[PDB]
């Protein structure tokens, strides 16, 4: 019952012939899976730890200058030399000043001058990298039972926490009373940590692209250095000034922390204080429900009186949740729950807390059901004291279809081709679609990498216009489709 | 000579006394006493409840 109260909850119904299903777990999202004869389960990816990170480069965001020295040659005598031009902890510059009898040369002209200052770092960014085999994903499996200790809670009293690694990617969770669930995950295709850097600047951290991190215009150390003193692009944090041609000075360029923050827009912030914790990204797992059984199917209907201790409350997903207590005699018993019409002639809705059962008498159990659009009645108990609860669902079936399609499009926009593994049960249509999406996404990422969202919108409009003003129908339709998809992606992206 | 100050920008700041308040769904906006003071930079957002 953990996914109740999360806006990004997903409902996965059905398994394949093998009693397995493909689910992609995202950090901010919850997945609830349902099969014809299995307990309802909630899946949450609650952690992603990167372990044993290695630095590959330390950038300097704030430096200072000291030990400034200058050399000069009187005109026509070539460029001057300083001992510090060979010292790597010094930043040097060559210029021309004006010399003459007043300055102390004896020839009139442009005499070369060089000034050097010792470059020191005061604050840096350590861009650690981690091996893709050091990633660890923690996934909580909570049975959607109705027992009070799991109604939207973010604790582990009833939820079972299974840790998944690239090495041990197949694990099973023992769910007391429901058998076991086997998770066959593929963390290696999850986020591709070999092309990413863990960027820790001060008390804030980000997950960034390794090419972007290696292209930064700041000075850097290789990460194997323990003393600094060999910064590479020291010229990026200094400026040499020769106003007119009378002096050459050199100054540092002030703390770059805020410029780095601006540069980090579009990078998902992570945590790196007490280990490298990443609360972003997804994990594709194949869920095996074959050894998964409903708890209490060998129970008798309660035949007693229920009381609604908490009124029926609607969630963001079109389902409803109701908390009922039991006051009858057969303690462990199946709860007689139905969602019918007023005349109780038809069954209109399905319950999500499949097989609700009263484990204890004065122990409230809260059922989740999905009632139909419009009027429906929740009937709890049997005739001697049966309670009938009116409910009204405000939406529409066409609106629900539109929202489902939009969620599908957004999943494709965020997971790309991994969205074809969400709720997948094999099938040839799914495989064909995933292959086509893989090829098209390769082309699209090649053509749109490094482009902002405004540029994507502009390109989409341009391509759509080209297609619309196209004489051939096939090329017209293809370009219009590409342009509309480009526009949707530009409107959905955060870039 | 005799310059007059036109405007003072901030290039480095610190944040303190962070507080939050929330309003349950459909019940309007929440309120902090700190929104009265201009020394506080406040932000309104929506949170799953």
């Amino acid at each position, epitope marked *: 019952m953990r996914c109740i109260g999360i806006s990004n909850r997903d409902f996965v119904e059905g398994v394949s012939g093998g009693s397995w299903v493909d689910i992609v777990l995202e950090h901010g999202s919850c997945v609830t899976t349902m099969a014809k004869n299995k307990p309802t389960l909630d899946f949450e990816l609650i952690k992603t730890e990167a372990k044993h990170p290695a630095t590959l480069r330390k950038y300097c965001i704030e430096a200072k200058l000291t030990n400034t020295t200058t050399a000069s040659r009187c005109p026509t005598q070539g460029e001057p030399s300083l001992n510090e031009e060979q010292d790597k902890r010094f930043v040097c510059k060559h210029s021309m000043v004006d010399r003459g009898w007043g300055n102390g040369c004896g020839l009139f002209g442009k005499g070369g001058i060089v000034t050097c200052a010792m470059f020191t770092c005061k604050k840096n960014m350590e861009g650690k990298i981690v091996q893709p085999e050091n990633l660890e994903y923690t996934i909580v499996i909570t049975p959607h039972s109705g027992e*009070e200790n799991a109604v939207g809670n973010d604790t582990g009293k009833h939820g079972k926490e299974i840790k998944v690694t690239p090495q041990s990617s197949i694990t099973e969770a023992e769910l007391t009373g429901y058998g076991t669930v086997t998770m066959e995950c593929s963390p290696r295709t999850g986020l591709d940590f070999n092309e990413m850097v863990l960027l820790q600047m001060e008390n804030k951290a980000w997950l960034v692209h390794r090419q972007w991190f290696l292209d930064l215009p700041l000075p850097w150390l290789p990460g194997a250095d323990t003393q600094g003193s060999n910064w590479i692009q020291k010229e990026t944090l200094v400026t040499f000034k020769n106003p007119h041609a009378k002096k050459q000075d050199v100054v540092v360029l002030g703390s770059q922390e805020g410029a780095m923050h601006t540069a980090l827009t579009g990078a998902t912030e992570i945590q790196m204080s007490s280990g490298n914790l990443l609360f972003t990204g997804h994990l594709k797992c194949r869920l095996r429900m074959d050894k998964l059984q409903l708890k209490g199917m060998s129970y008798s209907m309660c035949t007693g009186k229920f009381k609604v201790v908490k009124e029926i409350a609607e969630t963001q997903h079109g389902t409803i949740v109701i908390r009922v207590q039991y006051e009858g005699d057969g303690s462990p018993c199946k709860i007689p729950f139905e969602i019918m019409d007023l005349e109780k002639r038809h069954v209109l809705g399905r319950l999500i807390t499949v097989n609700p059962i009263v484990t204890e008498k004065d122990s*409230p159990v809260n059922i989740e059901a999905e009632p139909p659009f419009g009027d429906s009645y929740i009937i709890i108990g049997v005739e001697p004291g049966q309670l009938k609860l009116s409910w009204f669902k405000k939406g529409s079936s066409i609106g629900q279809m539109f929202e489902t399609t939009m969620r599908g499009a957004k999943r494709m926009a965020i997971l790309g081709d991994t969205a074809w593994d969400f709720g997948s049960l094999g099938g040839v249509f799914t495989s064909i679609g995933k292959a086509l999406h893989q090829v098209f996404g390769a082309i699209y990422g090649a053509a749109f990498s490094g482009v902002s969202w405004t540029m994507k919108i502009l390109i989409g409009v341009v391509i759509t216009w080209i297609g619309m003003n196209s004489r051939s129908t096939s090329l017209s339709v293809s370009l219009v489709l590409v342009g509309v998809v480009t526009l949707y992606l530009g409107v959905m992206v955060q870039a | 000579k005799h310059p007059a100050t036109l405007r003072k920008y901030c290039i480095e700041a610190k944040l303190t006394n*962070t*507080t939050t308040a929330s309003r349950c769904p459909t019940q309007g906006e*929440p309120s902090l*006493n700190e929104e009265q003071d201009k020394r506080f930079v406040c932000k309104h957002s929506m949170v799953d409840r």
Partner: antibody
Amino acid sequence: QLVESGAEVKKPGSSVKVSCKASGGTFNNYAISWVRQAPGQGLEWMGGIIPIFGGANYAQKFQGRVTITADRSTSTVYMELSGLRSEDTAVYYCARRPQSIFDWNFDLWGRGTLVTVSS
Amino acid sequence: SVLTQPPSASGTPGQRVTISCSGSSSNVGSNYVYWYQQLPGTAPKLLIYRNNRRPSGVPDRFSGSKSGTSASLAISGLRSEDEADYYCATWDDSLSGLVFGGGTKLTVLG
């Protein structure tokens, strides 16, 4: 751990603010409630707050008279009483419970701050 | 409607005593009931939470009872330590707040 501010002596019509610092885990994963006990009397719940979320809930008796606030930077929970009177003399406790609307077990309590209106 | 308890309760060492917490369906019978043991000059100690549940580290002599609208707390064996005020707390839906039992002091003899 739940540490409360020291005892305070006030006067009628004045105000007293009681603080209750808490650890990081208990601040961001739990809720803090305020319960008073007048000497020789039963506990009385005044209100509480989910410090991560704010927006305190107040008992009807103390509605308009109390203000519970949480300082996220210092991970401290504050309680302020306005219009103090003799009948408001009592020891005030800050207690920790889960941040769920159904479970109200205060498994961890502060020592308790006593507010008096006399010398 | 609100929680009500006997103001005082007597007993003898090595006895069984049950304290009753009576409320309306709004507070007791529609929500959990919590029992707190407070010693003189000390913050109350959580004794029973939810219903008939004992927090880890509490002796088994304490047992809570929940009826359709009323609740009780029973003590297995009595001692001088049991002499203390006992409160029952329960969320009230109509009052929109937590209501305490009002107190019940166990007066062990001897």
